[PDB]
Design a protein around this ligand. Structure first.
Ligand SMILES: OC[C@H]1CN[C@H](O)[C@@H](O)[C@@H]1O
Length: 438
């Protein structure tokens, strides 16, 4: 058996735009994902977050599912434009009401809320003023964060400033695949820097407003292996694509060496002037992890991926469970944060409801079991892993892939909004109840 420490936090995770629908209900302002998905050509099949899982209406049922499964923590995000429809200034009480009911319900049921302040649904009003490209977003984000802390910090004690700021910056502003759909490398690196500045101002506000809680930040991470002996190409991908891009500034006061070699010209001229503020102390690091990549020197960043004959998910992502052990070891070794969480881990497979009314996702069980086992390993070797969150509770709007990719441990029939707990959800409930694997 593999038992986890007493009090280890087993959770599930979602994000507001991916599950809620009703993006303009009850006085909410448009987000950049509303306007991006409503632009033809940006999302597969023309899918949008208009309805999604209708969590805006079905939230109680969904939390009752979390409760029924015995899951101990729920990581969810707040829609900024539901709270401040123009991004700054006016606060929308109906938006606060929506999350207040979710928080109170979770607490009543003994489930720990972990709140992601920003999971990509920037108010459209702020995008008109440059969004993450504008230095002033450090202020806008601090004002937003302060509203959340003032209204919710009496009850929510676990906070995440940003989800996957690399994706926000690079996929949103260089690749143009995500909102706001731009392709400018100078804008993309300004966004990196402003994400750090905004993250740090929010932590600063947090210390002033929620004197008894904890706050951290969440990064996407891949396991990059070298194709041969381009072991530097691996070094660059780690430093650029993984936690170092942000943690080197937070813990060491500068970007990683190979990031600076690639991107110095694209950063503001006097970017170091902001580093002392960026070092604002954080309480934990959240790492997301899905996939490994074989990398060789080559390509726009002098790096290309090499395909491998390994099992893959429906995303085409190679399944490399040891990657989660590696990234956990590596973060301790490099920055030694006081606490770590796996804030997302999961897989998309082509789920089908069998004639027996069940979803027999053995592929997903195998994926999660392998990764949980590797996380356990990291714990045995001294990594202060405090929790593990499965992405996701529900099949949902998977960004530019729309509804075509299902990551839930609960199946959603979008024609009816019926929820069907998958075999993986049942399996996970047992893991949680047992506090580990058997
Ligand atoms: O692509 C799967 C997930 C990757 N991480 C993001 O936080 C989440 O929103 C995505 O659905």
């Amino acid at each position: 058996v593999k038992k986890f420490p007493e009090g280890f936090l087993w959770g599930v995770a979602t994000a507001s735009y991916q599950i809620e629908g009703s993006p303009l209900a009850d006085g909410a302002g448009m987000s950049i994902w509303h306007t991006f998905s409503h632009t033809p050509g940006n999302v597969k099949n023309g899918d949008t977050g208009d309805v999604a899982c209708d969590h805006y209406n079905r939230w109680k049922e969904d939390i009752e599912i979390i409760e029924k499964l015995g899951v101990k923590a729920y990581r969810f995000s707040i829609s900024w434009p539901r709270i401040l429809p123009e991004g700054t200034g006016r606060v929308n009480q109906k938006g606060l009401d929506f999350y207040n009911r979710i928080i109170d319900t979770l607490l009543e049921k003994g489930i720990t809320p972990f709140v992601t302040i920003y999971h990509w649904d920037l108010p459209f009003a702020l995008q008109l003023k440059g969004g993450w490209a504008n230095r002033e977003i450090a202020d806008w984000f601090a004002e937003y964060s302060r509203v959340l802390f003032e209204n919710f910090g009496d009850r929510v004690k676990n906070w995440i400033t940003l989800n996957e700021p690399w994706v926000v910056a690079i996929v949103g502003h260089l690749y143009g695949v995500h909102a706001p759909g731009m392709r400018d490398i100078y804008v993309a690196f300004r966004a990196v820097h402003n994400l750090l500045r905004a993250h740090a101002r929010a932590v600063k506000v947090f210390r002033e407003t929620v004197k008894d809680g904890k706050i951290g930040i969440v990064f996407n991470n891949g396991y990059f292996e070298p194709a041969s002996e381009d072991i530097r190409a691996v070094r660059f991908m780690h430093q650029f694509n993984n936690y170092p891009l942000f943690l080197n500034p937070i813990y060491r006061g500068d970007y990683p060496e190979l990031v600076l070699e690639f991107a110095r010209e694209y950063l503001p001229e006097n970017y170091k002037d902001d580093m002392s503020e960026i070092q604002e102390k954080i309480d934990f690091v959240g790492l997301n992890y899905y996939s490994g990549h074989l990398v060789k020197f080559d390509a726009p960043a002098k790096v290309s991926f090499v395909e491998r004959d390994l099992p893959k998910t429906a995303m085409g992502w190679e399944i490399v469970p040891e990657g989660i052990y590696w990234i956990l070891k590596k973060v301790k070794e490099e920055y030694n944060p006081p606490e770590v969480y796996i804030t997302e881990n999961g897989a998309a497979f082509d789920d089908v409801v069998s004639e027996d009314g069940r979803v027999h996702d053995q592929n997903r069980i195998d994926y999660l079991k392998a990764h949980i086992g590797q996380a356990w390993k990291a714990i045995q070797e001294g990594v202060p892993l405090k929790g593990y969150f499965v992405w996701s509770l529900l099949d949902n709007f998977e960004w530019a892939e729309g509804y075509s990719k299902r990551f839930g441990i609960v199946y959603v029939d979008y024609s009816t909004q019926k929820r069907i707990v998958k075999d993986s959800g049942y399996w996970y409930s047992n893991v949680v109840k047992n506090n580990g694997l058997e």
